[PDB]
Amino acid sequence: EQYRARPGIASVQRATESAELPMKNNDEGTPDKKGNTRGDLVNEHSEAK
Amino acid sequence: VALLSGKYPPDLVTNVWYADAIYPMYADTEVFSNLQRDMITCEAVQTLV
């Protein structure tokens, strides 16, 4: 084992390890089994900001 | 600044470098699983309507 990767294996792993991660679920705005929409009572413009 | 001061390593050899860059990165690939999900995500939509 006289080889040292370049770029390093560790380096690249950790890096792709976080790219792997799927984007977060965005409940806000949808209804729950009871029929009430979830989220906070905030203006659409304000929320965006 | 970035555009103004870039340089490669003097001992660069693409064929080797990228090989070492892809291996660890592809070894953690999730393509396959995402494909399966994409399949359901659809079935779901279809069912709903």
Place this chain on the structure above:
Amino acid sequence: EVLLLPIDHQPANVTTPTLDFTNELTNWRARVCELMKNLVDNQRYQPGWTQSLVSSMRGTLDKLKLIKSMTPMYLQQLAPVELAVIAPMLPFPPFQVP
């Protein structure tokens, strides 16, 4: 099978010259410099400048124009490849508009 790019891409080749005005980006660097030069040359656009800064202002631009950055080289040869080597594995596939 397509991946759009807002740049022109070329075949990879590390032997490429640093001052290759064939490279779109490198040329821009130049053109923008020579423009400024023309602008500052007659000092018609900068009264209230007590001493002649043409000499210096020029060289200063010349230095930037001819700086040996390999970034453009990369942004046109490897960058594109790298992006392509990733796209497929990404969790959120690309979504472009021409």
Place this chain on the structure above:
Amino acid sequence: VLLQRISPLQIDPTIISNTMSTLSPASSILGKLRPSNSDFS
């Protein structure tokens, strides 16, 4: 980030520093670029 450590390109501001070699137009541009700052996100 992935892109950064999968890429053979290295950013080294000193290049600018060494080319300027220094009202001074030369110094102005330098103070404007700020080579010491290593963030390139």
Place this chain on the structure above:
Amino acid sequence: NKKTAQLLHADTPRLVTWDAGLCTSFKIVPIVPAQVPQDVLAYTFFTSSYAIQSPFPEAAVSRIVVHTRWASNVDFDRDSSVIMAPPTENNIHLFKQLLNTETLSVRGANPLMFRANVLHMLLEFVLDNLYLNRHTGFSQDHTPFTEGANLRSLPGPDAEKWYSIMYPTRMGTPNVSKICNFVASCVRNRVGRFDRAQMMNGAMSEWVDVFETSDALTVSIRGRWMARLARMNINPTEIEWALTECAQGYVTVTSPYAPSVNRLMPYRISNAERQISQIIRIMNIGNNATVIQPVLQDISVLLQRISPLQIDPTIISNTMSTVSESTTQTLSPASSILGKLRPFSSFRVALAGWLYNGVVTTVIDDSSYPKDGGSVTSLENLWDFFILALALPLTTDPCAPVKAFMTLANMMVGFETIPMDNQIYTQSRRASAFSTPHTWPRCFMNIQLISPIDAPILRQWAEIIHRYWPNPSQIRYGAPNVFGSANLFTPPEVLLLPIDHQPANVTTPTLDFTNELTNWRARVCELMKNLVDNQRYQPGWTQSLVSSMRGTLDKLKLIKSMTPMYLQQLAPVELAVIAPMLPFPPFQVPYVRLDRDRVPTMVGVTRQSRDTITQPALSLSTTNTTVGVPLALDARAITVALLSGKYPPDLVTNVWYADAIYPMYADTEVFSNLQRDMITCEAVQTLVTLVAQISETQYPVDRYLDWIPSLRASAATAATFAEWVNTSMKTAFDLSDMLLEPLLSGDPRMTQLAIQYQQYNGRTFNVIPEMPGSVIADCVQLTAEVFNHEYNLFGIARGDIIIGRVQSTHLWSPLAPPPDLVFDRDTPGVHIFGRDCRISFGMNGAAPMIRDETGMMVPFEGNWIFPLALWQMNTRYFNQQFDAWIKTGELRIRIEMGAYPYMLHYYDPRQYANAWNLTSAWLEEITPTSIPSVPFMVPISSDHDISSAPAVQYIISTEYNDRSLFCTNSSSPQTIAGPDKHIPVERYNILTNPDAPPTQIQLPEVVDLYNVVTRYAYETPPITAVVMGVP
């Protein structure tokens, strides 16, 4: 400031170096000891048993090895040696010293870096041999071994050893030993001193030619080195003349007239060489004022010390103490002017600036103009105008005239008005702003636009500027027969001046007003006086103030200052007399008066080229970096200088200067600088020539190391390479400052030197310097050409290798295998492997198979061809899949390498020996970044019947590589088993072939190890030692 210093005094290279030892770089070493004592030849047979000292090693095996200056005895170490170890020890470390920063293993090196490394190696091989062969002394032979020859004596104790390695023809020949046989067959008469040049009875011989061990290569190198210096030599008389010419006669030196003893004094270089460095010089300074300023200050002082002129302000105060005026008055022309003059640095500097207007443009400091612009109603401002008018004309600023004009125009606002060009550069814009041609107002060039009625004064001021502004001139300086010429845009010996110089015809000065600048003062005053007596301005002053103002102006006009005179008669000379001694020679651009069309608007230098442009002249216009900066001076001071100059009472120029200058011409720093320039240029070319071996340049060039692999080189690897070439040079010449650094900016693959300047009308002037030769460069390329043959001697093997099992009792050298064992791409039934190669595992007993290059799938057996890279990129997988078949199976692979370092392992032929363990390690330690020296297992040659025994081998070469071998059983009568090799006669041609001239060499195919060497003993005295001055 690191640059600043280098301008004033750059480290001078160490050119002359001497070597009293042997001029050889190859040594014969013992690998396997002799077979003595033995069971057949009685010990009483071997010479070694009688303590006889032999010319060559007495051993079973001996090989040649590279080792620069192993026998040399020098005065200065160029610390750039190349030392190899016997092939039986690992040498890998010599071929990984460069780009293997990423190479992990210590026993390994990266092959794609081979050429780069080898190249640099040869560069040092040369650098480390750059010496002059010194002559020592002799002694006649008191024995009959030679016919009373004169044997040269090496210095140092423990010398008796050399006399036997030195002359082989001297040994006795009692034996029938391989050695004696050689010796015995050599011509007797070619040993010891051969010929000499004895000129002075009882002094040393000027030089001597002599036979003795050495190597044709390094001998040739040193030969051309001396050749190059021999061209730079100058003699006392030439120096007498040169110096005498520079001093313009004020100083007189002397040279002797009689038979000398030959002196080597290298100083004369070509103009080309001077220009090239004067460009490099300019390069690293352009735009950075703080680098050139200290240079001017220096000259500033130099002047002050030599000039007989002295500034004494009391002059102004005295004449002013007699101005007539009333005490009941509010203003005092007399007082105000004194308080404005506040009665030097700036004066002396302004003069110095005349010598470098190429890169430095002096200008009057903004702070010297009235804050608001001034008003002709303010006595204070009227003096402000005066001060400026008198000073401007001494600056190199080509726009001074327009400023001198506007300066008044600014004060006249509302009083007298003129038609300006536009709404931006208005009649009220600070005069100090009209700094470029494009700004010269129309009315300033076409005076007629100024109304003689609505603007009388302003007009007259313009007419004056036009008719009385100083007319530039010139003066000849220097002596190029020795110093060459650093002038770039002007002719040699020419020194331009922004003033008219009319040499003085006398040596006993007297006040004189018939000067260019004296009139200028006059006119300026007369103008003022008119502005005052102006029918529509004079009514605003008390009738008394006018009288006073007039009186004062008159006293200023008629003031007895010498400055104007000095500036016309002496100043120019002083400069001309200094110029030749400056470290940074003058760099000028024509001084045009009011011919704006010819005003300089740009000066730039190139040191690289573009895309596909290969001709300097074409890329120059678009690849230059502009140069130059402004330096501000204090108008106040300058005027005071022009107003209060004074000469010593009983001055006598012809004497005064004879004293003042003498000491300045006892500073040989000048000559030293030449030697530097000499190197600076060798360095440059050496770069391009080497760089062109690893990359593609625009220069025509040799090429001999193309067979040694090398990576695809990027502008980065290029620079990194350059950086080493640089270092090594400095190191070998003992330089601590800069060299090539200025050119190293980014990418060096297209370096080129040229400079140009441009006029306002757009006409441009180019200056491409003619590249002179290079000995350093030529010598590298020479040894490279030899490397292409004697490569084995440098620890490098050529060709490829073949990993395959070969068991037998035979005794051939694996480095000289037998034909039928090697195969190549064009051999029948051979399989080549390319990129798409993959492996499909076997199943249910079937065999596994690897893919062909044509898409055929074969089993693990037969003869394959693998390019090294292919294995490297799959070491593990391959070693795992193939090793087993290579060892005990029927698979044989030929790895394509091109060139590779090798290491030998000798063994006793009578005992079993299996090389697997050795080659197993090799294969297993191959990486996509490294490979260890290829190991070969070779048999020990014997000098007597010996039993035999099996030997299993796995690695052999593709072509002969045993050229490193010098001799076997050198002390025995003959080698009976194993490789037999008798002392290589070819290498001792001068001795073995009687019909050959003594002076014949065989490069570049064969390096002779015994030649005729010329040893000098020339003296290297300091100039001050032979050229004497007459105080």
